[PDB]
């Protein structure tokens, strides 16, 4: 025995990769056969399952998250001026997939807006999204590739890899304490 390749921990659920211990743990974080965890902000929920199962999980356990059909919508976040750590979530359905639209006000204050595909990293690469804030002869735009829920959004948000704005920018675009984000999804 010159050396040995070890199977990925998720080999049981179908990973055929075999690797030397050195880069086993490296593969096992990237591995696509890794179960999906709950993609809602606030991890009061600790559900796991297969990708097929996720949409149903949200449909049963997160009924208050609501969905819109369209490749162009307006995500109207209400009570934008609420103090402290706030979340806004909704779902956008188009091109046969479901996307999670997230806004996060963090405490210091700063807002972060980002879109994730309910799908795989490879699938996420087929899509682009635009976020845009609008006011009288004023527009702020963000354009990026959506993250797979597999990857999540937490590190993106930490790295400011998304639309970022502060409370004062919010006031240039907010009407009656509500902010309208124009979300547009497309293929590429």
């Amino acid at each position: 025995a010159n050396s040995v390749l070890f199977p990925c921990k998720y080999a049981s659920s179908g990973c055929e990769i075999t690797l030397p211990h050195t880069e086993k743990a490296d593969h096992e974080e990237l591995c696509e056969f890794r179960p999906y965890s709950c993609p809602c902000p606030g991890a009061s929920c600790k559900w796991q399952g297969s990708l097929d199962a996720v949409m149903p999980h949200l449909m049963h356990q997160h009924k208050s998250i609501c969905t819109l059909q369209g490749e162009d919508i307006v995500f109207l976040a209400t009570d934008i001026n609420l103090p402290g750590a706030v979340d806004w979530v909704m779902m956008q359905s188009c091109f046969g997939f479901h996307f999670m639209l997230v806004l996060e006000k963090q405490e210091k204050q700063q807002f972060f807006a980002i879109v994730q595909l309910i799908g795989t990293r490879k699938q996420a690469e087929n899509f682009a999204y635009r976020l845009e804030l609008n006011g009288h002869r004023r527009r702020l735009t963000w354009e990026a590739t959506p993250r797979s829920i597999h990857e999540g959004i937490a590190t993106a948000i930490m790295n400011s890899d998304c639309l970022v704005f502060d409370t004062s920018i919010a006031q240039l675009f907010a009407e009656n304490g509500n902010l309208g984000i124009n979300v547009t999804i497309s293929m590429c």
């Binding site: 902000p41 162009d72 919508i73 995500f75 109207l76 402290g84 706030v86 979340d87 979530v89 909704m90």
Partner: peptide, 13 residues
Amino acid sequence: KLRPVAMVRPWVR
């Protein structure tokens, strides 16, 4: 474009 508007209610952590 033809744009459906959806109102999203906040959740405080």
